[PDB]
Amino acid sequence: AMAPPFFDLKPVSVDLALGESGTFKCHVTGTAPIKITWAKDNREIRPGGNYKMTLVENTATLTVLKVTKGDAGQYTCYASNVAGKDSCSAQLGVQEPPRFIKKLEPSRIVKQDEHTRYECKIGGSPEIKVLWYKDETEIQESSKFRMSFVESVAVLEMYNLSVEDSGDYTCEAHNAAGSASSSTSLKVKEPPVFRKKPHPVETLKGADVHLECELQGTPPFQVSWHKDKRELRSGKKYKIMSENFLTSIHILNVDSADIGEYQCKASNDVGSYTCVGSITLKA
């Protein structure tokens, strides 16, 4: 019997993370008793579920106890008395944590100097922030490590790869509601290279002679020696040493057939290379 309800403090819209809780608050004036009801997308909110209503001296609150995706929607507080009615509304948005729709593959071997590209697809509520890590350290954007995140697709492209780039790479995504990650292992290998052509080695008939090639690259290597289209093998005539950075052949009891060109081929997972050397004869 006189002033109708008027909400003089209206509730504030909010986004809440899955699993969290949150409260809408408003305040009403007018002739008592003012009846208060709440609705979620127009459906009357009833006690004993995920919503708790409180009303104390004309301050009305609605708490969502444990946020689920279904809780997203419009929450309206209605006030009524003999004189009239008012209502006020706020929106609840629900944030879902990031999820990898497309994960990284487990491993890769790449050759030194090459480039490689990693791509993930990540869903969940915006804004999602994506960072990449190498052996637990954040990778900084640069001409060598180019990153992007456009239309849910996260990309790391890496250039000029070197052995120190071998290790564990992680793409981690986070937002207001959580985080997720996908990891992979990279090994960068140097191909075999024989950078220096050996000088020819002169010998005498009946003597022994050593020929060697200096080798660079990521060991271990498979190594073969050849002359005149025949593979030369360790035995009574040849002693062959294949160390990580030096390959050698020791030719015993030299005769005319040993004079000429020798080839040493070295290979690993990522390349091969051939060294050519010659034995010459005195007298």
Side-chain angles (χ1 to χ4, degrees), residues 123 155 182 195:
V155 175
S182 180
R195 302 210 162 275

Side-chain angles (χ1 to χ4, degrees), residues 143-213:
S143 60
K144 180 168 183 185
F145 299 95
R146 287 294 188 202
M147 287 157 293
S148 59
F149 182 51
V150 302
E151 285 202 5
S152 305
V153 181
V155 175
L156 166 66
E157 197 143 17
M158 294 187 289
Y159 299 86
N160 293 340
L161 288 167
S162 184
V163 295
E164 66 277 4
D165 297 311
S166 297
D168 296 323
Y169 289 80
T170 296
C171 174
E172 189 166 57
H174 74 277
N175 65 10
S179 56
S181 71
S182 180
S183 302
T184 189
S185 173
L186 177 67
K187 193 153 136 214
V188 180
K189 300 200 199 203
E190 303 169 15
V193 177
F194 291 111
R195 302 210 162 275
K196 287 179 185 190
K197 176 182 173 67
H199 296 124
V201 193
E202 187 184 71
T203 186
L204 286 158
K205 285 202 186 182
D208 305 337
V209 64
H210 169 96
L211 175 68
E212 73 182 35
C213 295

